[PDB]
Amino acid sequence: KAGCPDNGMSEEARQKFLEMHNSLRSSVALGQAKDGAGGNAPKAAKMKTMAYDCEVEKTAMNNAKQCVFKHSQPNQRKGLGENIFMSSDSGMDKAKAAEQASKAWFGELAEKGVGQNLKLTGGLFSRGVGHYTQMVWQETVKLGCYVEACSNMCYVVCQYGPAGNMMGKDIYEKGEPCSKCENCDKEKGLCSA
C-alpha cells in the first residue's frame, strides 16, 4: 500500500493485508466482532489505523524467504511483533493468501474466545489467541507482510510496527468508538491521530 519495491510481493496483496487489518480492527472497535467466549468483543475507544510499511515488509520477507514455518527471533525483527501462517496451496494467489492468513489469525477470537478483560495476562496469552491480539493491538500502527511460495507450502509472514502482545498491557482501551481520539469516524471507529 504504496511505494514498496518490486520484490516479489504484489501491491495487490499489500493492499489486501492492510485492508483486512483495518477492516477487522474496525469491526472489533465497533463492538461488532463475535467473541467465542460469548457476546461480542468490547468496543475500543481509540483503535488506531494501521499503515503499510515497506521497511517492516522487508524484515517479514527475511522470515518468509527461508521457507520454514517458524517464528523469527526478536533481533531479526527488532521492535516488531509477528504473525505467521502456512497453506498447502503452494502456488496460491498472494492476495488470496493474504486474506486466508488474516482470517485465520483473526479467527482466534470467534473460536478460542477472549472475553471482556483485555489485560494481556499470561493466562490469556497461553490460550493461543496471540495472532488475534496482535492484529487488534491498539498501539500497533505499522504492518508489513510477505508471501513466499515454497516447495510444499505458501508461507505468509506479517510483522507489526510497535510490537504488540506486551504482557500486562491492555490489547486495546475499552469504550465507545472514537471517544478517546480526534481523527475518527464513529461509523468506522479507527483513529488516524
User: Which positions make up the binding site for Zn(2+)?
Assistant: 71, 131
d(CA 114, CA 15): 28
Binding site, by residue number, is 71, 131
Residue 142's Cβ-count burial label (10 Å; 0-12, 13-18, 19+) is middle
Q: Go through 109-137 and write b for each residue having 16 or more CB atoms within 10 A of its CB, e for each that does not.
A: beeebbeeebebeeebeebebbbbbbbbb
Q: Which three cell numbers stand for residue 159?
A: 510483522
Binding site for Cu(2+), by residue number, is 71, 131
